[PDB]
């Protein structure tokens, strides 16, 4: 018994209308056959359609558009549909559906000119209502309406080519792991030895004042040059602590509480980082809160480290990749790095208009996808390195902080493909 509804259309142009109408009709309980519905193709399909139009099709719906009007496959399907119409002696068999505003009723195909067409040009809902009323009137075979059929067909056919798949993927973060710290954090009682109205940011090694204790990983007499009075200090006055205990969280006392003892390691490593960036002779832009470190035009061979460009041109603006670093110790002892792009007029002097810099940064980052961010970040941090595996922050005459040159890696069990 014929109970299938055939929807002929121009395959590569009328995907949207055919898809919507088919997914509506199947949910309504009407059997629908179409080429886009069936997933996979073979040589047999050209034969298959024919037998359907001759053996199972009870109604034939022709999508009428400027594309499908003169499409050879559509024309062949129309011919076989007209001839099976003749053989069935049923005149209300082919039901054209006009969906194009630019295809007037005076330019339709010859097989369709004399056939009334359901108007979809204005409202698709009105056309679908007309289709339902006509199919009900002509007593077309129908099953109970069930939208779950439409949902299942959507899942097996269309969200089907783009689905969750399980396969391991490894990701590269922006966190540089800290391999080791100096053994003991030193609290030296300079007191009157260090002038109170003095600034510790100019000190040779990083050091922060807390009460009358200078806190640093540096040795007692490393600050002799900037502080000539410190030659007569006594090393038994230090409050050296096993920093690894601080990282574990074991150490806490009235002298210092571990939460405010972790901050004295975060400012310390931040000053170490900025000092190291000064050592590498990379220039800086002042941000609203932080500071960014970018490189000149010409310091790198052809303005690129490794094979990847870091300083480039854009009309009259020289753009430079820059990083901002900050030591964080809550998840792990790590240094977080963020990426930025800053523009200059001549490659050396920063453009003073913040709005222009922001707009040009947006213009440049318009086309910077994952392999433009990760690659430049990794190239910059490798240029920052001292060896092939890690670098060190200068913490004293003999104390260093060892930080890996490769970002922290995680392991994902689910990924995808283009």
């Amino acid at each position: 018994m014929r109970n299938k509804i055939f929807i002929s259309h121009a395959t590569p142009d009328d995907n949207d209308f055919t898809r919507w109408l088919a997914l509506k009709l199947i949910g309504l309980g009407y059997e629908v056959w179409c080429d886009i519905l069936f997933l996979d193709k073979g040589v047999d399909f050209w034969s298959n359609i024919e037998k359907v139009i001759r053996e199972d099709t009870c109604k034939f719906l022709l999508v009428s558009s400027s594309y499908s009007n003169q499409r050879e496959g559509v024309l062949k399907e129309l011919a076989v549909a007209a001839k099976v119409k003749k053989q069935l002696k049923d005149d209300k068999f082919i039901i054209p559906l006009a969906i194009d505003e630019q295809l007037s009723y005076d330019d339709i195909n010859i097989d369709i000119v004399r056939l009334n067409a359901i108007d979809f040009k204005m409202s698709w809902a009105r056309g679908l209502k007309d289709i339902l009323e006509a199919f009900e009137k002509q007593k077309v075979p129908k099953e109970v309406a069930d939208a779950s059929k439409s949902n299942l067909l959507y899942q097996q056919i269309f969200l089907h080519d783009k689905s969750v798949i399980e396969k391991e993927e490894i990701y590269d973060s922006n966190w540089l792991s800290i391999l080791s710290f100096p053994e003991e954090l030193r609290f030296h009682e300079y007191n009157w030895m260090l002038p109170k109205r003095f600034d510790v940011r100019e000190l040779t090694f990083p050091a922060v004042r807390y009460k009358n204790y200078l806190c640093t990983f540096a040795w007692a007499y490393d600050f002799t040059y900037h502080l000539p009075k410190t030659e007569t200090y006594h090393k038994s006055k230090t409050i050296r602590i096993p920093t690894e205990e601080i990282l574990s969280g074991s150490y806490d006392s009235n002298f210092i509480r571990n939460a405010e003892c972790k901050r004295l390691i975060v400012q310390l490593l931040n000053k170490a980082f900025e000092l190291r960036m000064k050592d590498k002779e990379v220039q800086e832009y002042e941000m609203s809160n932080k500071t960014a470190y970018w490189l000149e035009k010409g310091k790198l061979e052809k303005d690129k480290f490794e094979k990847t460009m870091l300083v480039g041109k854009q009309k009259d603006k020289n753009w430079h990749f820059a990083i901002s670093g900050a030591s964080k110790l809550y998840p792990f002892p790590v240094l977080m790095i963020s990426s930025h792009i800053f523009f200059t007029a001549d490659g050396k002097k920063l453009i003073d208009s913040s709005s222009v810099q922001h707009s040009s940064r947006r213009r440049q980052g318009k086309n910077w996808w994952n392999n433009t961010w990760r690659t430049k970040l990794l190239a910059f941090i490798k240029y920052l390195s001292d060896d092939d595996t890690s670098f060190y922050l200068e913490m004293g005459s003999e104390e260093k902080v060892f930080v890996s040159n490769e970002p922290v890696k995680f392991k994902g069990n689910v990924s995808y493909n283009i």
């Binding site: 409202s123 698709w124 939208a147 439409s150 973060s173 910077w368 283009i418």
Partner: protein
């Protein structure tokens, strides 16, 4: 080499009990849940702007297409998706003469001119609501571009066109939606550029806001907002457990009164007897002194949580068995002790903080594409990172443009299992009714609470504001 868990993508419910991962595709095939017979629309504005509204309504009557259907689904037409009538015939039109708008706009005082422009529209809207037999569901407020350029804070009127209240913000939208709160009139503001933009062009000649490829999604984001504002339920959640109220606090700054006073506002989402979700505001705005405190004093915290529990008791009968109080800021013990007292024994209070500040940015080894959305790095049973912004295959692209930034989700207070906390926030990022997008970059409670706070801090004379979002978004 640290483990990274993946949470299944949430599914939202549509008509006939059918579930679909996408909102656009599910809506375009199954339609909304409730039968809203028709949208009686009222419009305010000039004659030049009314033609554009009529043209756009006629456009969205017919189907529209995007550049690529896979990345952005096609729009089958308003009545096609929403099975509800919304035509250009039957719109109640109210006039705003160009002389009236130019008389007030060209004023030196930004506060005074914005107050006058809001007053001009609001007087006519209230007069039409009160003194006309026509019933209009939503009042589409067409505003020109000159009002857009010269009626917001920090807007400098050029010296050549300056021809000639301070308790209200210079923001047209915030003040506008604030002063209509007493009358409970659902409204939506439209730029003339958001309308048929092809008229507005730059010096190069291409439209300033060229939306050639994004016409379909523009229609999706306008149609869904119009349907929600008329009293529709486009979609809901399905995996949310019974007895789980959420509640979301956010703090906004108030400039008019001395001391910013840090108004705190909340939006409450939970279940109803049956199967329908209820996502309203829980608005008792509790102002907090101190310049930058953002921690709420015990009396106001008690009042807030008591009101939140009562709005659940009155609609279900008994108190929630487990709530997830989300917030943008960390919880001090002072608030939590106050919260604990109000709640009974059976309730399990949970205080969660969600933030984007810390720069964790996962880069995959190869490929011009970002991490999957749903990837989570669990730091510990109390803290985790969830990539609610990222790639999803269904929309063919990542929701972000550059590499995305995840959400640091930590359980400051209560106990809560981190997996379930990560399971509800990702689902909570699906109920964005102001826009029809596959997913939202942040949970909607922290977003719609932000919106209602941005509206409630514009008028200092507000009193007992409505709890429905349609008056706010």
């Amino acid at each position: 080499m640290k483990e990274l868990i993946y949470i299944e993508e949430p599914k939202i419910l549509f008509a006939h009990g059918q579930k679909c991962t996408d909102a656009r595709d599910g809506l375009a095939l199954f339609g909304p849940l409730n039968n809203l017979y028709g949208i009686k629309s009222g419009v305010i504005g000039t004659k030049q702007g009314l033609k554009i509204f009529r043209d756009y309504l006629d456009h969205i009557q017919k189907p529209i297409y995007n550049s690529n259907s896979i990345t952005r689904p096609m729009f089958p037409g308003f009545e096609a998706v929403f099975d509800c009538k919304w035509e250009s015939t039957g719109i109640t039109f109210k006039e705003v003469t160009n002389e009236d708008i130019g008389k007030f706009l060209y004023n030196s005082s930004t506060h005074k001119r914005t107050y006058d422009l809001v007053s001009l529209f609001i007087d006519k809207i209230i007069s039409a609501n009160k003194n006309e037999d026509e019933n209009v569901d939503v009042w589409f407020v067409i505003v020109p571009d000159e009002i857009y350029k010269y009626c917001r804070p920090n807007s400098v009127l050029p010296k050549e066109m300056v021809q000639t209240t301070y308790n209200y913000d210079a923001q047209f939208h915030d003040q506008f939606k604030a002063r209509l709160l007493k009358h409970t009139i659902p409204t939506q503001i439209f730029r003339e550029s958001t309308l048929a933009w092809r008229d507005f062009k730059n010096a190069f000649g291409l439209p300033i806001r060229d939306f050639s490829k994004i016409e379909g999604h523009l229609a999706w984001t306008i149609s869904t907002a119009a349907f929600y504002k008329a009293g529709g339920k486009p979609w809901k959640l399905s995996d949310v457990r019974n007895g789980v109220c959420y509640l979301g606090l956010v703090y906004k700054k108030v400039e008019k009164s001395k001391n910013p006073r840090n108004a705190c506002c909340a939006a409450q989402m939970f279940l109803d007897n049956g199967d329908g979700t209820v996502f309203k505001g829980e608005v008792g705005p509790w102002y907090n002194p101190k310049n930058g405190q953002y921690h709420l004093e015990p009396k106001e915290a008690k009042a807030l949580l008591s009101q939140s529990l009562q709005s659940y008791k009155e609609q279900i009968g008994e108190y929630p068995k487990e709530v997830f109080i989300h917030a943008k800021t960390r919880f001090n013990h002072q608030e939590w002790d106050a919260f604990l007292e109000v709640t009974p024994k059976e309730t399990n209070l949970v205080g969660v903080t969600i933030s984007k500040t810390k720069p964790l940015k996962l880069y995959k080894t190869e490929g011009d594409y970002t991490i999957l959305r749903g990837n989570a790095y669990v730091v510990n049973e109390r803290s985790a990172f969830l990539w609610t912004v990222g790639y999803v295959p269904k929309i063919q692209t990542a929701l972000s443009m550059e590499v995305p930034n995840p959400l640091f989700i930590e359980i400051n207070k209560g106990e809560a299992d981190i997996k379930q906390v990560l399971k509800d926030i990702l689902s909570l990022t699906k109920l964005n009714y102001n826009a029809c997008i596959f997913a939202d970059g942040e949970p909607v409670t922290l977003r719609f609470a932000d919106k209602i706070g941005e509206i409630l801090t514009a008028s200092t004379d507000i009193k007992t504001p409505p709890l429905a979002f349609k008056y706010y978004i």
